[PDB]
Symmetry: D2
Amino acid sequence: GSVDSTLGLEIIEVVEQAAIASAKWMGKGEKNTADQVAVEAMRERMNKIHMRGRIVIGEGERDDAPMLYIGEEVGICTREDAKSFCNPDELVEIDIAVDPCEGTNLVAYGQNGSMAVLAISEKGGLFAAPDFYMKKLAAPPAAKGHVDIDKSATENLKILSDCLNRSIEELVVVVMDRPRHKELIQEIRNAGARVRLISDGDVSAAISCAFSGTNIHALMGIGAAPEGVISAAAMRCLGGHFQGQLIYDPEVVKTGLIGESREGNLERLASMGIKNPDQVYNCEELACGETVLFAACGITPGTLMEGVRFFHGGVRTQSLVISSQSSTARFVDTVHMKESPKVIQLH
Amino acid sequence: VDSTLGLEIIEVVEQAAIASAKWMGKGEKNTADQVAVEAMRERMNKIHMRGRIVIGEGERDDAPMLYIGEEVGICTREDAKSFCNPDELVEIDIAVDPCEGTNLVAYGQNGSMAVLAISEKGGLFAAPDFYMKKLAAPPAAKGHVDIDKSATENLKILSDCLNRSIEELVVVVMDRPRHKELIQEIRNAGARVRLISDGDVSAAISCAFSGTNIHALMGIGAAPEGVISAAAMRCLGGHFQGQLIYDPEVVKTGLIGESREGNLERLASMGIKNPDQVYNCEELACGETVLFAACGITPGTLMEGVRFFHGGVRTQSLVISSQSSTARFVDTVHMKESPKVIQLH
Amino acid sequence: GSVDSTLGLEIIEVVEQAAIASAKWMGKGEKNTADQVAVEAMRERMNKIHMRGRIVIGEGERDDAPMLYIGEEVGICTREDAKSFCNPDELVEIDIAVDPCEGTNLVAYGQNGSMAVLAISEKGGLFAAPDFYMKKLAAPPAAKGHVDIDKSATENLKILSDCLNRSIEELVVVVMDRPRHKELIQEIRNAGARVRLISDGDVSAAISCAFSGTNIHALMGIGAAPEGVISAAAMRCLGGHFQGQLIYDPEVVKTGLIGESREGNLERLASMGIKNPDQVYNCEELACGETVLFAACGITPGTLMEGVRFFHGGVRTQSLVISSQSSTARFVDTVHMKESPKVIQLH
Amino acid sequence: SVDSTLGLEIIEVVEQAAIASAKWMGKGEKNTADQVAVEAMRERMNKIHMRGRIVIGEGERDDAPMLYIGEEVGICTREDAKSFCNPDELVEIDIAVDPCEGTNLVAYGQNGSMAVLAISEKGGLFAAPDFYMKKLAAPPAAKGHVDIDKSATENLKILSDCLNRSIEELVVVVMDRPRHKELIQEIRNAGARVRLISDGDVSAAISCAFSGTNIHALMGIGAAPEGVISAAAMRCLGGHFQGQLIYDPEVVKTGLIGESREGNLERLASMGIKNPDQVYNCEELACGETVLFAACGITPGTLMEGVRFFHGGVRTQSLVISSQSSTARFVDTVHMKESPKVIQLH
Ligand SMILES: Nc1ncnc2c1ncn2[C@@H]1O[C@H](COP(=O)(O)O)[C@@H](O)[C@H]1O
Ligand SMILES: Nc1ncnc2c1ncn2[C@@H]1O[C@H](COP(=O)(O)O)[C@@H](O)[C@H]1O
Ligand SMILES: Nc1ncnc2c1ncn2[C@@H]1O[C@H](COP(=O)(O)O)[C@@H](O)[C@H]1O
Ligand SMILES: Nc1ncnc2c1ncn2[C@@H]1O[C@H](COP(=O)(O)O)[C@@H](O)[C@H]1O
Ligand SMILES: [Cl-]
Ligand SMILES: [Cl-]
Ligand SMILES: [Cl-]
Ligand SMILES: [Cl-]
Ligand SMILES: [Cl-]
Ligand SMILES: [Cl-]
Ligand SMILES: [Cl-]
Ligand SMILES: [Cl-]
Ligand SMILES: [Cl-]
Ligand SMILES: [Cl-]
Ligand SMILES: [Cl-]
Ligand SMILES: [Cl-]
Ligand SMILES: [Cl-]
Ligand SMILES: [Cl-]
Ligand SMILES: [Cl-]
Ligand SMILES: [Cl-]
Ligand SMILES: [Cl-]
Ligand SMILES: [Cl-]
Ligand SMILES: [Cl-]
Ligand SMILES: [Cl-]
Ligand SMILES: [Cl-]
Ligand SMILES: [Cl-]
Ligand SMILES: [Cl-]
Ligand SMILES: [Mg+2]
Ligand SMILES: [Mg+2]
Ligand SMILES: [Mg+2]
Ligand SMILES: [Mg+2]
Ligand SMILES: [Mg+2]
Ligand SMILES: [Mg+2]
Ligand SMILES: [Mg+2]
Ligand SMILES: [Mg+2]
């Protein structure tokens, strides 16, 4: 059959539960704990769905990550003993990209910008990105195809100016606060644009570019490739601009494995069957499937989504779920009622 | 009842609202009603469920769509056993009000929504088309106010329960001659009032959320709408009581030669032993599982109305489930399509 | 001197106090009481301002309306000893148009759309409109000068469609629910636009056109002339489109009394020195002063402003104040603390 | 008596300072972001018919060119003021300013920065020296129940009771500093969630006063002057705020060369501060009969939205609190510049 329509709704609960678990550790100074509980919650809720999924982006390779590892099967319909309870649509093989705790250190420090996020497409519909750095350009729909990752930041800012009908001084660029971005950040400043430096969480920044109202208009710089594919899935559905280019030269940015070599990384990519390492991927190439789903829920507060709030008698979450199938972007504001709360706030 | 049914109903109310909204201010209340009915029905029939309409547009051989007893959903057909699973094959009863406030839509006025409620078979009081005295109030007031108490005593109780003065209370009442004395009493008590021409469902549920500046609904409305309201209120833990009214001296249906003696007959032949019985919302929505869904057609207290813009549509729905024990506001941008601008709000 | 800068800020308190007073009568079924308290409160608060004001649009003529009548002097600096306790800027003569309770029946019924409103300019800076009907066309800044009040509703909708870059079906026109608008409403429906019929209060409707997010894009039809001037004041500061034209034909619309005639009205209009009654004015003409101020506060909830809320330990109001002098549109969300609230809500 | 319109005119003061500073968001110049805010604030203040003295500001006259301690601001400070100012405008008022609260937040384009000031009659505001200050901020419902001398653990228990919610349902803001290692661990051990900030404890303190911020207390050590400014706001809101001067470099160091506990003790005595270990509540930190507070977001924060530059204008959000009118005002201002074709409702 074809990807189950209700999947795009049911993923709301996946990210909600993952975020709620992770949020209990906000500012607790335990980044691995924040990450691990989100992983367990996401995996648990996904395994209760009537789907036949494979993790193509996750916590690591099979013998590195015990849960949500690359190649892991998730969903009721992956089980030999339960497959007969699944209908043809639910049996459709789908690939899944997960990032249960985007910004583990943001959560640990109780800082803004963290979220629980996943993306889905039919089998083979998501670029199974290796854990390499990725040069990224994110921009709003109005600039899609007009800006380009190969152009300089200055040129892109001028193009954004035209496309968004505002001055460069009236633009805001998000860049990760990293030494590798010193020249890039200086260039953006010299061009006249304002900047928001983030310590982590470039998935939220990228997607923020798509929505007029965030006062964020572009993401520039180098982040992680897997996160890039997840961002691209959202942008593909929203019609936003997103390009990525894999970085494999330790001179530009270091992977952190001693001792990394340009040829070393090159061989691995070749080994993974990646023919063109300098290849630039646009949005539709990183998320190329016929059906693309995206789900996110705020853990801590951010530009796109409110953080998880714990109050007397319940919890409140905010999620964004995007579906190419229904062609919708849904903001879900959920009050989770614990036990007969005497007061329920409208907002 | 399937866990995903509580999410699927989002699309049910969204599509009903969108269709009806296209007729905002067009002065056709039946048209606005009919396209909503059809859209809700069509979207329901795409769902893997075996549903039955227990509250709807009318009886079979009268109302063409969403009539009493109508089977809806995929699993109602033969053989569902082959196409849907045991959870999906479960029999559920459905109460619909596809266009609540048909004149509101026709006039482009606030307060209309597409609404429905669900439970297991037997889980919803299949209210007859009679009037119902209603009392809705916030969870803080649940069990403290009472429908049999006067407006004045209820206001005093509300004052204590909500820790605010009567002057700091707002009561919603339907603008009807039958409420002249009630409205006068509320005014004398010192509470502020919002009079509505139609749509007491939104008013009832608004009592449940702090921030609506609405704290109670009082008066007489339709019984079916009462049940749908009670479904939401039970999930939220809000106060809701209803009492059937069958005395034309108090209020008339419009049926020719309608008599109290006559109404009582009808009620009995319908299987209702005590027509003067007060039901709380747990009794009106008594099923193990209760679901409630609403989407704004025009702007209102709980939800924004439907907006059409260049490149799509935007809706706001409220979905409430006792199974997940959640209240979900769903703000959906319907991209149609490839819009160059997407607003955050 | 020039109109005092602080006057643009002081009028916040004027509309807030008028709206708060009026809101106490929400749903009481007394439209005159709701009107009178707003009138008195606005007047009282204006009389504490260091200004030299004259009412040019108000509740009626002296010897008829007791408060805020035509020609009434308001403000501390209208006193005979003014020069001694007022500075030059405070002594400038300003004309004031008031509508203390816009939508008295809305308040009486506890329905949406009522507000306390006023406009200010230097002496002569506001058209002292007579109490006649006025044909009006309101639209957003993007359509300014493109739509025209003399064009048909059908023509204007096509122009609006082009200007706002959306279809006619994606437009919302507000028209007063009146028998005089039967054909107009039908034409708008035929053209494919959606419609909001209002029972009262076309001031809010006109200004809503200027703000994206209101889902209101045009005001068409006939309303009261004085309300039109007040609306024109706001639209002038906002750059919105607003045209007015006096209507004095009893066959088109009647003022209700008595033995009224076009010829009779024509004489009265000549009597006030209104040469050309059929003259079409835009908002720059209706509010032609060098300085224009506009202030409004919601009484009941509406499209621009939230209504007045009374809660335990205070009151909450939302006002909109627009100044040509500071070139600002200010939404003022005020928590009035009746000491001392144990709980203060952020919103 | 203090002029009523002053409580409104300060909207423009913080707006102009915030707008000027916001132009430097993420531009890596904390000193520039700071300088322009200072200048815009002072320039705007000097257009006001007031008789003001700076009691909290950028530094001593020798060290700071603008908004220095003792500087006179406002039209009615001029020699001929009696001639052009009225009696209320002639009332001597003390002013505390922090034109750029979080200069590095702005330079890095991070959340939490504001332009802010506080006003009272002469002697109405504690003229805090630039020393560190132990602070405890909490909501009105907890006022007088929590206490700065109590441990974080007991205060959290008290907060739980007052705010009717579990300790796990509380969020405490703490500055991310080594001096707070133990304090943070204790809060974590008690079961509360934590938001660590790199700067901007004024915003964190005031956020405690408003339900909806999901922030319930501020604990730890910040700058004393900022504390006084925070107290003015909290005093007007009925929120809890206590401060205690810290002068022992063993706890926290000013960084000045050879600063010693006795050194600071000597300095405080010199300044006329009788008891350096005294605990002040916000009524004591802001003791004036009339208190005014004004803040405008520079970058986005929990309390206020940041400055947005768009095609045809700027948008700011400010909070202005007055004990005189007893009002808390949020001001959302679209600065049109000019003839913008599109004006967003929000
Ligand atoms: N034309 C406008 N009029 C008023 N406010 C605006 C306008 N454009 C942007 N804003 C404000 O700036 C925020 C960010 O806008 P944007 O930078 O386009 O994402 C919006 O959410 C509004 O608060
Ligand atoms: N304690 C409070 N402090 C500030 N504003 C409030 C408070 N209570 C209510 N409000 C305002 O009044 C609205 C309606 O409140 P309520 O009548 O409880 O629904 C809220 O959404 C706020 O805008
Ligand atoms: N391009 C868009 N994307 C998403 N929502 C929109 C868009 N345009 C308008 N809306 C929604 O419709 C409302 C009214 O828009 P408008 O008719 O332009 O005033 C907005 O406040 C949004 O909720
Ligand atoms: N009783 C409640 N019902 C629903 N949402 C709530 C409730 N209490 C708090 N929240 C949410 O949590 C946020 C912060 O709450 P608080 O920690 O009291 O500031 C609010 O703005 C709401 O979004
Ligand atoms: Cl499994
Ligand atoms: Cl942060
Ligand atoms: Cl990496
Ligand atoms: Cl698209
Ligand atoms: Cl792209
Ligand atoms: Cl859809
Ligand atoms: Cl419950
Ligand atoms: Cl059937
Ligand atoms: Cl109806
Ligand atoms: Cl009656
Ligand atoms: Cl009926
Ligand atoms: Cl007089
Ligand atoms: Cl006078
Ligand atoms: Cl009116
Ligand atoms: Cl004259
Ligand atoms: Cl006609
Ligand atoms: Cl009416
Ligand atoms: Cl009118
Ligand atoms: Cl203009
Ligand atoms: Cl014209
Ligand atoms: Cl003008
Ligand atoms: Cl409205
Ligand atoms: Cl630095
Ligand atoms: Mg992770
Ligand atoms: Mg990550
Ligand atoms: Mg219907
Ligand atoms: Mg109905
Ligand atoms: Mg009036
Ligand atoms: Mg009027
Ligand atoms: Mg400073
Ligand atoms: Mg500071």
